[PDB]
From a paper:
Recently, we determined the crystal structure of holo [name], a [name] polyspecific cluster A-I SBP, and reported a method for purifying apo [name] in the presence of the Yfe transporter by fractionation, adding an additional strategy for the production of apo SBP proteins.
A possible explanation for the improvement might be that gentle pipetting better preserved the sphero­plasts, reducing inadvertent rupture of the inner membrane and contamination of the periplasm with cytoplasmic contents, including metals that can reintegrate with a potentially apo [name]. Diffraction-quality apo native [name] crystals were observed to crystallize in the orthorhombic space group P212121 and had unit-cell parameters a = 40, b = 52, c = 113 Å, which are 2 Å smaller in the a dimension than the unit-cell parameters of the His-tagged holo [name] crystal form 1. In the apo state, [name] has three grouped (His76/His141/Asp282) site 1 metal-binding residues linked to a rigid amino-terminal domain lobe that serve as an electrostatic attractant for metal ions.
Residue numbers in the entry: 40 to 225, 239 to 311
Write the structure that this text describes.
Amino acid sequence: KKFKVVTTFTIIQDIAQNIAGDVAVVESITKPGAEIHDYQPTPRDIVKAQSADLILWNGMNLERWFEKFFESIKDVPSAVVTAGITPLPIREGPYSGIANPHAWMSPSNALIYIENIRKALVEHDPAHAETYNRNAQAYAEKIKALDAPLRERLSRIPAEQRWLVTSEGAFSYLAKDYGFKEVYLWRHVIDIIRENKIPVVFSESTISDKPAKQVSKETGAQYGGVLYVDSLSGEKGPVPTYISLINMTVDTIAKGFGQ
């Protein structure tokens, strides 16, 4: 029998499947592309999680539905994969002061995701500890190697122009790592764009693109479209892995800035 792991969403699924390798099967509760914050689980989502040996979740109140969901599950252990991360506060807007849950968009934070998943797997499936530890070591080397080329590419964007328009803080951890300022959009966004001649504006995927488009139209900044960071694609889609999500997000940002 294969140890069965269930995760709340696809980013954790991919990180955990690299650590589990061949000795455990990792499934996500939510399909690729699903809205993760207020997902509404079905009765069969609960039954699927009930068949697992371990449930992994992000915490930091990413999954507002998880506490109720988990209360419906009997005697399946869970582990929060962000234990030990320094949470960034949402700096402005209606959620000012609250922990920003999007911690996976910092590649350094992904090393802590890996460590917590490895620990939980080794705790609950000790027979396979050697495999989990080896796989976590090998995958962590891949993740450490992510940061250098991304940092170098984004560092060519002059610091004066290094701004991201944010609505729910989906990019705040990437912005912290690579030195981007953030201006919140619930217009005073227009002024900051014009003042610093920020060349491009992106939209978050959990909100309407209309206000970001209005900002672009009025300032003359290019509208670079939507940046999706809450989900992977399917296996055969263009964003099948956590590594591909990080690399593609930075490439889209950098290209928006002519870099």
